[PDB]
């Protein structure tokens, strides 16, 4: 457009000139477009927009070659030179004042079923790929591009898809868990409210999935977020424009003092979001959150919700035993093809919500039961009677023998409220103090 | 009013233009209007005020498509472009400047009887639906129009009042308690002074209900704060303008020390409100607050009052299981039918005060005794006298054996002060005869 | 003034162009009063004063219908604008920068006796309503008329002062409290060096009260303020300008680690106000504070001063049942007549110290045991020689959750008050 801007803005010139010429040697040669005509101009010959109608609320000019509409500044000034460059950095502003006046307000498009890729949309509704339009209104995009594939490509005889199953130690479940998982962090319109969890005791291809991810995605379309920063003031506003956020390293067994931020964001509940010395506002952010971590961190709210929105993948398989290679990470993952790869692969394929693998549901029992000393308590309760209040306290078996702070008389209503036997009141079983709960009896006749 | 101004621009032009011809070729062929006459135009033509004579303060514009005064300077500067395209940001702060001068002072229109509606104006004294006009003076409306509404709408075979009911477990006292929390938080200007607390384990609906009152209201008319995050610093600036807040997970069993703010917001009572790098000032917020949690949150204050603005809604309906469907939460409520049926009816009930159902008086109790360890213990007590006082201090019964935090025998006057039941206060000096202080006296035999 | 303004302004622009005319067509014709010649008129017509030579203070200009000078720039600047409209904010400014070198500097009027009410000012040595003057120099006043009463105003069947016997459960000195907190409540430049604090728990109407202050005075003139929240930053300036300070629920128990400035607002002492990102200064505040709250909150220092600086108002009546009226805080105190009333009868009522009602001096005493545990032991344990005996580390801490000391501080007792010796006598249930 650089060329198209540059001739208009010699004609106008030379009919500025043209029209001082027929009135006489008067404005001393005018020779610099006006920024009003200058606007009036770049509004008739591009595609100028404003997000919205609220204050200082910057224009936003289509990038014919990128196919998604920018805010950034440098840009329209170098468009303004390109029409008028004798404009300084004042009368540019004036220009783009003006455009702001002139040009009128449409809302980014947020429907889920539109996928911005760096080829083009993505529509989902009917799986194909639509050239860029003005009419979709995208501020940013996925890096990678989206071309049609046949085969899987293969560098130095190294294969994506069997890398794949060697990650999942040859599962099939986890590995369609995974492409969905990929699928899923390329949507930002849509969440589907699961919080996923990568458990890793080594080198186990974490991260080297989590770059996979940041590559195939737009490095600046994730944001880098753990969980038990979400409550701290400011760390949520990098959950902006971003598509995902991803936590690199969660601290082993760290605790999570409240989690409401957390939760919010993934179920695309509406969170309160401010910025460094800026206004508060709240915003619904449906980025997907995908955290890397050794071992599990633990929640505080111990309550059926964090239950309802984690996922686990196990990510059992151990490569510091196998020979490192850096060059799948450093190398492999960054190339165009496996990349384009995974995009097609991960865009084509459909799923209304994440399957759980048989191996997530033992390891979400398993953070259950470690989490809250409760449920732990009952599923290896084995316990025949059920009268005795004391007795079924037990002192809890030791704290579980994970020395988690327990209480007395009221985690025992946590314990009948969370479970066919019910409660039974007996006055021969019961009240006869035959154990003043240390306690090494198991099970009684 | 863009065509008008439009109009009236080329003719002012042209008229300057003319006088300039008459004067002869001296002022270079005048083409902008003075900012000046610019102001004198829009003050004629249009409808600008300002809210109060404060310093500072900002002009408001009459939308009239909207029908709401507006104070945002983009939609100010883009009706003087309309009028003079040629002016500068600072001629366009001129005119703003020459308008502020000019114009009269109205404070904004605060009636509780009065609702601002996408569609216009509902007056609850008359019931009725009026236009907009330039004399009701408001700077936000309700996001849903209101219209005459029959037959309940029903979008791929759903019905909004069935998963009323539904999420109330076909109770009618919660329904219509729900319905009377839907009308009230519209109203920006009456409060009623409850603190709507939704309560469930999970997939009770609460999100589902607190996001279709946020649609059913306008979204910017909604304000997002927790009860913990009342009391910190530059967080009640979010409730300038909103008709209601909402609090989309309190963490359970949050201890909140101070409850200062959140109990001025829930009563009609002004509070100390700052901006960012703005100065403080003194505001009366009349928002509904609705907070969701899993679990009533521990308050620091055990006095009554407090228990009294708090009110608690019971959802103990479960869609864990397959029984969820996306689509109600995503879709359904986001319909325009299904909002304007809510609005019209939530509109259209009137009474004086929340409606307290039998559970939320249950639940609520159960909060007190949760609360107030004094309280539970004597609710607890079932000890029929009580001349031993020391007994009675057992630790309140070890905690009325749960855990807690006791004060060393400070609470005396508190038991007096929770319930005297029947017996009042009784204290014999015959007392000293029984042995001191452990869980065998559960029984009024002594 | 706007018609005197609009006439000057004509007057002077067809003078000069009279005087563009006699002197033959130079340049452009001027139509634009020069601001200097501005601010001449408008010192020569209007009434434009400077409280203080300090730097870069603002022009106060005499509201001739207000009857109080405002320094706020947006009136003087749509004053200019009637005099000038087509000077633009900048040759305001000029404007207003030139009436500061030529107007001459007055103190503001800070006699206790004089009272601005929205009719006129009112004259306690008189006991008179006397009309507005530019010569009182007053920046506020109060937002309800003054107009004599004889019949006491009843709407819809309800009577203020009933309802004030009511809010008192029906105690004579309760109510007399009451009326004399009002009346140092309006007054903004008298101080009485007392803490006025609303102690009652659940529905008591200390809200109501607290409301209908607000009303009969400015709305704008009360500051919003509760007892913890005045030591830390910026918190002051919001007392700036205020004839009163509300707090309308502070926490119950709250810890006030620092009352150093609680205490400088609460007497005449002066302290320094900071504003936000402005030049902070030294300012005496002589509005009172009013507290309401569940409860008495207890102090650190648990001092002499704290204790004479406090004084306790009773909300015994509960209206937690149907006897609540929404209507008494909606709407009755809202009622100009209800109003003027309260402002006259308060305002008439003269005193020099509040009377202490009985139950006042009772929860004062209360108090004094709760903050302080050396006083409550001292009440409690209603011999002579044995000091550690009675020290007992305060009989085990008289039986309130304390904390002691290590018998060395517990002799301060005797300040409170063991005459002075024994050789041979120097948990329990034990004097
Ligand atoms: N097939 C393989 N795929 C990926 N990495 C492999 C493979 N075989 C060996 N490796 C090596 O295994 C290591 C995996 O690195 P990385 O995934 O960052 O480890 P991690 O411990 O999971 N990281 P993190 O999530 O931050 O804790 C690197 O040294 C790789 O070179
Ligand atoms: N009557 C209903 N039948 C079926 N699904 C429903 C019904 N009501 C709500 N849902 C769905 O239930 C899901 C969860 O509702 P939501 O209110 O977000 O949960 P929540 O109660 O906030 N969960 P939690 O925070 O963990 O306690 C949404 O997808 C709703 O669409
Ligand atoms: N004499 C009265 N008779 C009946 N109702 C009254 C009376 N005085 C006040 N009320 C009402 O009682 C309520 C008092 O609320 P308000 O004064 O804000 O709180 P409070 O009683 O001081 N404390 P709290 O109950 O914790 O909010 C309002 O509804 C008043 O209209
Ligand atoms: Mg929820
Ligand atoms: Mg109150």
Not at 28 to 56: G, M, V
Not at 369 to 385: A, H, I, L, S, T
């Amino acid at each position: 457009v650089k060329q198209l801007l540059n001739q208009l803005g010699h004609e106008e010139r030379t009919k500025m000139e043209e029209n001082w010429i027929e009135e006489g040697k008067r404005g001393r040669k005018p020779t610099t477009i006006s920024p009003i005509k200058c606007a009036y101009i770049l509004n008739e010959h591009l595609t100028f927009i404003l997000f919205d109608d609220e204050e200082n609320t910057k224009l936003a000019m289509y990038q014919f070659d990128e196919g998604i509409y920018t805010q950034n500044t440098t840009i329209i000034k170098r468009v303004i030179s390109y029409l008028e460059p004798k404009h300084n950095s004042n009368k540019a502003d004036e220009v783009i004042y003006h455009l702001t006046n002139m040009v009128d307000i449409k809302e980014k498009t947020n429907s889920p079923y539109l996928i911005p890729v760096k080829n083009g949309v993505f529509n989902r509704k009917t799986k194909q790929l639509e050239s860029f339009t003005p009419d979709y209104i995208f501020t940013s995009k996925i890096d990678t591009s989206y071309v049609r594939q046949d085969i899987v490509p293969e560098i130095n005889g190294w294969n994506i898809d069997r890398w794949i199953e060697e990650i999942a130690c040859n599962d099939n479940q986890v590995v369609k868990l995974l492409w969905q998982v990929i699928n899923d962090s390329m949507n930002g319109n849509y969440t589907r409210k699961k919080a996923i969890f990568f458990v890793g005791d080594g080198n186990n291809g974490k991260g080297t999935f989590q770059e996979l991810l940041s590559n195939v995605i737009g490095y600046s379309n994730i944001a880098s977020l753990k969980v038990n920063e979400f409550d701290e003031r400011f760390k949520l506003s990098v959950l902006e424009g971003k598509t995902a956020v991803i936590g690199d390293d969660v601290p082993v067994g760290v605790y999570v003092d409240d989690s409401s931020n957390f939760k919010s964001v993934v179920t695309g509940d509406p969170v309160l979001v401010e910025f460094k010395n800026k206004p508060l506002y709240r915003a619904t952010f449906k980025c997907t959150v995908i955290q890397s971590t050794n071992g599990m961190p633990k929640f505080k709210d111990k309550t059926g919700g964090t239950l309802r929105r984690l996922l686990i993948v196990p990510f059992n398989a151990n490569f510091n035993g196998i020979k490192e290679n850096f060059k799948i990470k450093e190398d492999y993952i960054k190339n165009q093809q496996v990349l384009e790869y995974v995009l097609y692969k991960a865009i084509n394929l459909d799923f209304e919500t994440f399957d759980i693998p048989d191996a997530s549901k033992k390891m979400l029992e398993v953070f259950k039961e470690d989490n809250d000393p409760v449920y732990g308590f009952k599923v290896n309760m084995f316990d025949q009677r059920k009268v005795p209040k004391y007795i079924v306290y037990a002192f809890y078996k030791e704290y579980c023998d994970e020395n988690g702070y327990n209480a007395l008389s009221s985690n025992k209503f946590y314990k009948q409220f969370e479970h066919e036997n019910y409660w039974k009141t007996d006055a021969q079983r019961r009240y006869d103090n035959e154990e003043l709960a240390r306690i090494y009896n198991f099970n009684d006749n």
